[PDB]
Design a protein around this nucleic acid. Structure first.
Ligand SMILES: [Mg+2]
Ligand SMILES: [Mg+2]
Lengths: 206, 63, 127, 70
RNA sequence: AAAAAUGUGAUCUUGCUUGUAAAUACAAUUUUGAGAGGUUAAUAAAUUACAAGUAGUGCUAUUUUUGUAUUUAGGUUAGCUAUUUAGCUUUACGUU
RNA sequence: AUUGCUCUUCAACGAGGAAUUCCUAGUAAGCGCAAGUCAUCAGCUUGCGUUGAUUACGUCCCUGCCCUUUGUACACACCGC
């Protein structure tokens, strides 16, 4: 609605996807409510950003990493490994591709799917090694929400990377697949498997 | 899977032989006013919520 | 209603027993021990093993037809320790979990009047 | 070599049957459903984009995401 | 495998107790750089092959048609661990 | 083969065991430049900017170091006597 004539002419589609709704890259950023206390506030879809790229003075105080967007976090995670280290643009592109793939698959909001995947991936209880004389006894311990989220983010990325290593399946696609798996809690994905293992370990040491 | 949704009222000191675990007093979401001191691994804050499997089992300072 | 037993947890250092019996004592039910459920020599008194043993005992009891127990605990006694082992408590916990009911708990460790000479010698036990 | 590089009329026909179906067609997706290898797959995809059938989503080098009409 | 029909003292094919004929090749990186002396001791595997004593069942079963076939195809251990509907290795057995 | 370039040869290596280094933000890692030496040679170095994360923001488990109290036949001081 209302394409205003600026001397430097803008594409029609671009003009359309502006102003009226505070969208993501192309499509809408709304909805996506987690409905799982702990992972609300530390998975932030409340802040509507247009690209998975900011300057971002997030690593500064302590919990400002929470308020950093989910997409951005994902991109950062992807950026892992020296060969691919830095190169945030590439990561962003990959993320975009993944999102597109998600959209293509069963319609549905891509962001929502991602969120779901993240939720699935967070381990509830993890073990930490205690001294206790000398032997390697491992006490099971509860996981803090932010930490859990971080772990989830990592795990998916790792899985994607694994999939990529000697493969057609372009990292983005692998990531998308992983996300899908997480959404439909299958235990075919890597992150999910890891989580399960962790849970088992916790059970063993309780 | 019976899961208990817990909530943090007070951080009761950093614990463990090493650094990465914290003692936390916990008033759980449903059925309030039953405080348990349980251990939390990551970054913790007042009003954070904890997802957990095995609820009624109080922990102590790890050696 | 409640068919009873006497649990008898001989919780020494370096092994636990769980020895469920009738009230007279003579006719036993299950004698399950720590070293029986974990073949590792070291892991006999170890809690997990003890728990396993307890579970086994409970199962046996169930098979037989018993509902409750009277916990009696025995530390090695006399010439040794007089200190309940690592896996008596664990065993008890396991029993509780099992659902085999509990009534009248005691420690019947044979703490003497004035023992006959102990371990070590006069200079003791010098690691 | 793991095969799936050899080219035929029959193979082409099977590929055609059909562009319809599949949420997305990605060179990767094509291989390995055990189809004609990489380049061949790409070519097939391109062909499919001649006159309708499969419309595009992305356009990048190697990240080429296409989906069924309409 | 499908099918038409001849004939054998009606017909047909589930294994049990026996002894002999044969396929686990070849080797090298290594073993103390080359030769000799022992596969020391130990030890045959069920697998295929023909016939017995018939529970079976009368043992041996022939002459001609339709297709490139149309037939029914694929895969199992052994150990460790309180990750025990899971984790790690994954044919061990003098060493490879 | 100083080094560069041109064609040709296409080896090992499918993310590396026991171990162990460095790191807390424009950092880490990547990326190149830059002077230094220099007649000629950069895989080095001191700087520089570009791209730019993950995870803590704690603890004394290890390692080292520091103190305090303790014990000392040591004072060339535990490689001691
Ligand atoms: Mg080559
Ligand atoms: Mg130099």
């Amino acid at each position: 609605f209302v394409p205003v004539e600026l001397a430097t002419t803008i594409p029609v589609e671009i003009q359309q996807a502006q102003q009226e709704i505070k969208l993501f890259n192309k499509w809408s950023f709304e909805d996506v409510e987690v409905k799982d206390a702990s992972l609300v506030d530390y998975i932030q879809i409340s802040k509507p950003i247009y690209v998975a790229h900011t300057a971002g003075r997030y690593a500064n105080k302590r919990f400002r990493k929470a308020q950093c967007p989910i997409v951005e976090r994902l991109t950062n995670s992807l950026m892992m490994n020296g060969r691919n280290n830095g190169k945030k643009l590439k990561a962003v592109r990959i993320v975009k591709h993944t999102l597109e793939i998600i959209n293509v698959l069963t319609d549905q909001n891509p962001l929502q799917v991602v969120v779901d995947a993240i939720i699935n991936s967070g381990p509830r209880e993890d073990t930490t090694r205690v001294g206790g004389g000398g032997a390697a006894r491992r006490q099971a311990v509860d996981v803090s929400p932010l930490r859990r989220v971080n772990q989830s983010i990592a795990l998916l990325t790792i899985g994607a990377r694994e999939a990529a290593f000697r493969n057609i399946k372009t990292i983005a696609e692998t990531l998308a697949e992983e996300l899908i798996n997480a959404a439909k809690g299958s235990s075919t994905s890597y992150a999910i498997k890891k989580k399960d293992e962790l849970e088992r370990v916790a059970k063993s040491n309780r | 899977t019976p899961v208990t949704l817990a909530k943090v009222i007070k951080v009761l000191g950093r614990t463990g032989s090493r650094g990465g675990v914290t003692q936390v007093r916990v008033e759980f979401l449903e059925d309030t006013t039953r405080t348990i001191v349980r251990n939390v691994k990551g970054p913790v804050r007042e009003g954070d919520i904890l997802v957990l499997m095995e609820s009624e089992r109080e922990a102590r300072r790890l050696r | 209603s409640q068919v009873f037993g006497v649990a008898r947890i001989f919780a020494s250092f370096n092994d636990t027993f769980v020895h469920v019996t009738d009230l007279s004592g003579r006719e036993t039910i299950a004698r399950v021990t720590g070293g029986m459920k974990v073949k590792a020599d070291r892991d006999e008194s170890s809690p997990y093993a003890a728990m396993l043993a307890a579970q086994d005992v409970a199962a046996k009891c169930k098979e037989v037809g018993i509902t409750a127990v009277h916990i009696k605990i025995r530390a090695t006694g006399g010439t040794r320790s007089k200190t309940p082992g690592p896996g008596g408590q664990a065993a008890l916990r396991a029993l509780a979990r099992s659902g085999l009911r509990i009534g009248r708990i005691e420690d019947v460790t044979p703490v003497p009047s004035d023992s006959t000479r102990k371990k070590g010698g006069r200079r003791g036990r010098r690691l | 070599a793991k095969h799936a590089v050899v080219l035929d009329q029959d193979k082409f026909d099977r590929i055609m049957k059909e562009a319809p179906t599949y949420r997305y067609v990605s060179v990767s997706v094509l291989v390995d459903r055990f189809k004609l290898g990489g380049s061949l797959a790409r070519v097939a995809l391109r062909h499919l984009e001649n006159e309708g059938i499969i419309k595009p989503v992305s356009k990048h080098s190697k990240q080429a995401i296409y989906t069924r009409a309409t």
